Design a protein around this ligand. Structure first.
Ligand SMILES: Cc1ncc(C[n+]2csc(CCOP(=O)(O)OP(=O)(O)O)c2C)c(N)n1
Ligand SMILES: Cc1ncc(C[n+]2csc(CCOP(=O)(O)OP(=O)(O)O)c2C)c(N)n1
Ligand SMILES: Cc1ncc(C[n+]2csc(CCOP(=O)(O)OP(=O)(O)O)c2C)c(N)n1
Ligand SMILES: [Ca+2]
Ligand SMILES: [Ca+2]
Ligand SMILES: [Ca+2]
Ligand SMILES: [Mg+2]
Ligand SMILES: [Mg+2]
Ligand SMILES: [Mg+2]
Ligand SMILES: [Mg+2]
Ligand SMILES: [Mg+2]
Ligand SMILES: [Mg+2]
Ligand SMILES: [Mg+2]
Lengths: 523, 523, 523
């Protein structure tokens, strides 16, 4: 067998059947004789390729395979990898290298010091020392991406390697099963459970690794048992809990003082599947108030190490959530009461308030819709106004890096063909990965893109307001026609200048047979 | 509180009370007002400092704290860190940096690009962005070193940071408990146990992480239950099993073909706490023979990823070994029969055969002796001739890097004051970290050093023999007087030119009140 | 031809004929069939190997070739590389890697992420992608080490590469000549010369790259022409000027305020071949006083970039010094008057004052002696008391990393067989690379080692004194018998407890036919 044949067999035997890519000459020897059981998803720029693959992996809860062109292609995707690192996304990023005979002279297309390029944003980064090592290296990449804590990995392969003879002993790679589905030992788990049972006023904080593990339902059971309020950890990349469940208390503000104030009076706070904490704004104060102790369950040693407070347990979120939910006592305390419905903001016949947009989406979208958020000044209102009952219903750029949601929404829709994906994206954010629209058109992936057009980098204008910062340049983005951009890439386009038009546009989009972009004129 | 005060409080609250170091000017502001409850262990070169700390950590099964001088001191210790990486040793390596005001100009003693210096040999490597961050950074270092898979970490601290005011919120760091004591979920564990119960001819292979976890006794129970032969994985850094237990089959040869041949006919091979496998010599063949399937339990995702065959489970070795030992059925098969005693090699009244030396050590040493091995051509015979009944009885440089055993033997003896440590070190190996002898003398750490003097790099002469390589320079090391070197550093010295003298020297050494070096004239 | 044959031909054609090494199994395929026109210099630990090679390169003013064993051997040499980086030493460091077939599984002796290991202490660091690339990679290493600014480089080679067929086109590598012997363009050089001619009170500061370039004599002419005082830049790794020349003003204190005060009243300060500046102690103040402007000539862009003041020219020191010396006018100003002889310190019949030792060395040593300094508390007095008329007469660890002088003194003596080398080394410093003594004995390299024994890390006790730092541990190093250590490694040993004995010991050492160590009892 050739290295080509052996590698594709390894991939299929490990459950991989799709290649997200933007091709180049170093990659042609890999892509030639493309297996008929594989499919290739092309995107026009590498931030888009990786974004689509990211959404696909996160929604599918399995590794996604990417093929990029050398250094330039890898480099174009680096911003996307920053998000993927923060969301623990299992991405196998492969990049083609020059033929081994031409690497020394640094011919055009040589990826110099390749393994160092994507660092520090990958778990593992490697170029094999020989062609016959390629399948083994790929095996390592697959497992490194897939083991908790999941994350992106990088493999560079000289283009001449593919046609070489493979090592017959590579067959041992094909069916390897590697598990990190582990939980705390019985003795210490019993101690934790007793601490939870004995809490007088427990609180629960959930992060994205809960949704990644599909531990949502187990966490619901856990919260019901403990009769505990449930918060989502700040800067949330995913939604780990039904947002209209009586225990739900919403998204935590990303501030030290704000969070300790919120947790005041809670004697035990159990954090599951989140960093402690992904703060953002400067908000100095106490990490925790006197009387509050914190216990964190995390799949990532790096999270456990850097928490400034509390105890920590490093284990699989799925296994831990299931164990806790089934071991804790049913508290005799009263179940928390559901949060009241959000108020309806006054809305005239003119430009749309973001609150109106979200209320309308919630009214019209299917109960199993999936939302993506890259409307950076409206996040708080979005979280308050969308009823998300099911797992996998929300994605937001995990490192705050714009250019995620547009392509990721396409990958999510590919992963979940029966769930309507609706991406809500600011006019500023929409530009970073605008060319991703073409992939939705070409493959007829019926994502709905809602562009919130207020003509400015609104979040930045706000922050600049609090800083009292004057004379800041570059905050306005006037003069973009999003319907024209959609037309450019073959996506049906609608405009909503008022509520009447928004309702009409959504009705049309929800019944369309392909992707649709709606440009919404917002305050 | 100052950063100095807060950091030392964090250290003591996290169980650290010893600093292994070689001081410099960047470190004086850290070492001043040295806490009276701490002790400082000085060594004369940094390979020695880290070697001593390594032995101490491995034997004590807890993190060891090191303080080195900037780049030059860190660099001197890099070889030692290569071993520490391979042995999963929990080492917290701190190095002093220039004052922040002088870093930009790159004053003398500035550690440039500090975090990159020790890579790729550390799990985490960092320099804090401000003085007040130092305690938090130290907390991260402690936990990163201590979490499975354990390993060395690096923290660089500008010397002006220590006197600065600490953040009062740093108190939350002091008592953090972080656990990675996890094991496979019940459902999948039941599947594994059933596979072991159903095996017709199981074999067990154990690596160093078993001894590190003190899982030895649990593995004995497991082997007795399964009535399974037990091997030690190749290139063994530690001893994970009683060497005269009936199930013990010895050290595996570090070759692909050799190991698959050894495992032939065994239907299920369970590897615990080892890489799969730390091969060494070129010995091409099948990774496993038809009929053999392999299951690996490892604490290290990097080990699980790179195994060329078998299934893998990433979990704590202590928790997994305990669970398996207590869950498996008692097989009705006959218990394996103990390996026969080694033959006595013919010995005249002249120079000592290594076999004679080991037989004599086994005859005279206490039953709870601890051995270190850096006699590279005699490893196989050592493993066959020393009865090691207890855990923590053997250490060998885990990356094959010479200069480990001499200093590590001092750290081991410090960790285990009631167990006689005997380091068996070749005349070549003895030189790499010779100055470590001084620390044994100064602190009266009563390690016995047995120098095997054959005048050559024997292992290299052998390999060169197999390669049929002619005209290889640099293989001979004549003209070293080890008694004089011992005298130089204040250690009692004896010479053994024959068996009569060896017995006499050992009698004296075993009854001495301080460290002793015995130079043995070997074939 | 084989890769082995081709590589050795490239080496000899590029002027390399010596390999400084400590061998290992990954290196045996390189060292086998060792060319009869090459010689191999063995040292017992890698800090020693690199130190010897460093001294050899610095004294010979040409690249030195080193061969180490994988990661552990490279790591052991990292401290030595920190000095080599700072001294711009042209060192070609090669390390053997595992066979390509075993790299993936990370067999014992695999150098993982090899190229990253020695960073940030090398100019270039690489592992070739194929065997046939090895000669080309070596060519790159040779030239990267040799081009201004000179420095250490690193090449990792899988052991199976050597026996493979070489590319016939590699012959084009053999005779490549690469030059960086450049100087400022005529127009701008004329501007500089006019600025020097027009200075009313110029000063000159010289660094180690002057001595490396053998530009010393040109700088003497330049100083005589300009009638300018000459200082040596702080933390001096070499001596760039005759120390009894009338213009000589000695070693600058390594402080910001001290240096600006020293330069006060000098309108133009010309720095040649030094960083601006290698300050050490905290000594805040003005970089330059009003009225002083600085112009730096440096071979290193990194030096030019980081200077906090002055203009800079990046060019070859030899070419620039020659041009300036021959272009500037002869000033009508009076030639500076020579510095007065140092005072004679009162000396009783007991322990030696360092001043006495240096005065005696100056009295008895040949006029073409070469000194090395690793007696860290006595540097100022050494610089004042040794008359060094010739180039290449002084070496001091360029990064302040101890363990340099002992081995480097052996390499220097090898480079300069007709110049008596005398290394003055503190009792603390002597231990770091003590095993280097063996190489001097084995090859009969007649270096004289003067050990200054005061029982303490004296420089550190002093600094701790100024810091007013109490309770600092680890500052004393009692109980070392250096005569015994010398005997251990086969070097003749003498002791000097007083002046009478010092004179007698020096008389014997200077007439000896081999290396000699003198242990001096100092205050
Ligand atoms: C790749 C990238 N570039 C720049 C930024 C900085 N940034 C954060 S929010 C923001 C404004 C986004 O504007 P828009 O998408 O219109 O949403 P709005 O703030 O108007 O609601 C910018 C530029 C970022 N987070 N990521
Ligand atoms: C730091 C380091 N340098 C070099 C080597 C290569 N090496 C491996 S075994 C060996 C010989 C050791 O000789 P000795 O200690 O006398 O034991 P013997 O082989 O004679 O039994 C050498 C040089 C190494 N493993 N580590
Ligand atoms: C490799 C290394 N480790 C530690 C230091 C810190 N250091 C600088 S000077 C010094 C003392 C040297 O003592 P000695 O050689 O006896 O000279 P003295 O100061 O007594 O004159 C030390 C430990 C260093 N510079 N390099
Ligand atoms: Ca906007
Ligand atoms: Ca030997
Ligand atoms: Ca001293
Ligand atoms: Mg596999
Ligand atoms: Mg258990
Ligand atoms: Mg802590
Ligand atoms: Mg379970
Ligand atoms: Mg490094
Ligand atoms: Mg060349
Ligand atoms: Mg010109």
């Amino acid at each position: 067998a050739s290295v080509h044949g052996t590698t594709y067999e390894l991939l299929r035997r490990q459950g991989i059947d799709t290649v997200f890519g933007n091709p180049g000459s170093n990659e042609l020897p890999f892509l030639k004789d493309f297996p008929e059981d594989f499919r290739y998803i092309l995107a026009l720029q590498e931030a888009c390729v990786v974004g689509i693959a990211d959404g696909y992996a996160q929604a599918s809860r399995k590794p996604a395979f990417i093929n990029l062109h050398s250094a330039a292609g890898t480099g174009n995707a680096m911003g996307a990898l920053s998000n993927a690192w923060n969301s623990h996304s299992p991405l196998i990023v492969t990049a083609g290298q020059q033929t081994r005979a031409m690497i020394g002279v640094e011919a055009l297309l040589t990826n110099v010091d390749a393994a160092n390029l994507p660092r520090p944003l990958v778990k593992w980064s490697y170029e094999p020392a020989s062609a016959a090592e390629v399948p083994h290296a790929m095996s390592r990449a697959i497992h490194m991406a897939s083991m908790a804590p999941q994350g992106p990995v990088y493999l560079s392969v000289p283009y001449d390697d593919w046609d070489k003879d493979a090592d017959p002993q590579s067959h041992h790679l094909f069916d390897r099963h590697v598990s990190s589905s582990v939980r705390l030992n019985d003795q210490d788990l019993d101690i934790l459970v007793k601490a939870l049972n004995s809490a007088s006023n427990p609180a629960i904080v959930l992060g994205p690794d809960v949704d990644a593990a599909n531990a949502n339902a187990d966490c619901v059971m856990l919260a019901e048992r403990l009769k505990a309020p449930v918060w989502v950890a700040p800067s949330a990349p995913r939604c780990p809990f039904p947002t209209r469940h009586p225990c739900f208390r919403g998204l935590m503000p990303a501030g030290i003082a704000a969070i300790s104030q919120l947790l005041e009076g809670h004697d035990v706070v159990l954090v599951i599947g989140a960093p402690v904490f992904r703060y953002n704004q400067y908000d100095p104060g106490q990490y925790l108030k006197p009387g509050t102790r914190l216990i964190s369950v995390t799949c990532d040693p790096l999270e456990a190490a850097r928490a400034p407070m509390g105890d920590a347990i490093v284990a699989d979120i799925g296994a831990m959530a299931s164990a806790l939910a089934n071991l804790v006592e049913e508290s005799s305390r009263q179940l928390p009461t559901a949060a009241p419905e959000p108020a309806k903001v006054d809305q005239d016949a003119g430009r749309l308030h973001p609150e109106t947009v979200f209320d309308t989406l919630n009214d019209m979208a299917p109960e199993n819709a999936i939302y993506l958020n890259e409307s950076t000044s409206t996040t708080a209102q979005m979280w308050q106004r969308l009823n998300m009952r099911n797992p996998g219903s929300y994605y937001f750029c995990a490192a705050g890096g714009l250019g995620f949601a547009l392509p990721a929404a396409i990958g999510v829709q590919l992963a979940e063909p029966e769930r309507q994906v609706i991406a809500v994206i600011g006019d500023g954010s929409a530009n970073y990965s605008i060319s991703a629209l073409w992939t939705a058109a070409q493959y007829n992936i019926p994502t709905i893109f809602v562009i919130m057009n207020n003509g400015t980098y609104g979040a930045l204008r706000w922050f600049a307001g609090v800083l009292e910062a004057e004379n800041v340049p570059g905050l306005d983005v006037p003069g973009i026609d999003f319907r024209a951009l959609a037309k450019g890439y073959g996506v049906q386009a609608l405009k909503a200048d008022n509520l009447e038009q928004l309702k009409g546009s959504l009705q049309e989009a929800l019944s369309a047979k392909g992707p649709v972009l709606i440009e919404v004129s917002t305050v």
